[PDB]
Amino acid sequence: AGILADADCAAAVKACEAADSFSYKAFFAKCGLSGKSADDIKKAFVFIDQDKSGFIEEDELKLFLQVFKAGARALTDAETKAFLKAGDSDGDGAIGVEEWVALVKA
Ligand SMILES: [Ca+2]
Ligand SMILES: [Ca+2]
């Protein structure tokens, strides 16, 4: 946990410390992931894909904050729901590497 921690993304985590305060656009504006290399954006995807399915499922989405900081809170079910819906364009209920790359963007 906190394997992808840096000042910015730590600050994004801190900004949604309270339950139901998170929105992925605001997070990523603070956590400059989009600004990274396409390789470095995929690496974050595989970090989050904790079961190695090749896809990020809602259960891993839940744990998104912990990837950027240790002891972070899990996303609430409603948060996880809203973030999945935003990222899952093909509607299989999962986020693929292409859907990831889209989602990260400003
Ligand atoms: Ca997965
Ligand atoms: Ca999908």
UniProtKB/Swiss-Prot annotation:
InterPro entries: EF-hand-dom_pair, EF_Hand_1_Ca_BS, EF_hand_dom, Parvalbumin. Signal peptide: none annotated. It comes from the Eukaryota. Disulfide bonds join C9-C31. CDD domains: EFh_parvalbumin_beta. Belongs to the parvalbumin family. This parvalbumin has an isoelectric point of 4.50. This is Parvalbumin beta.
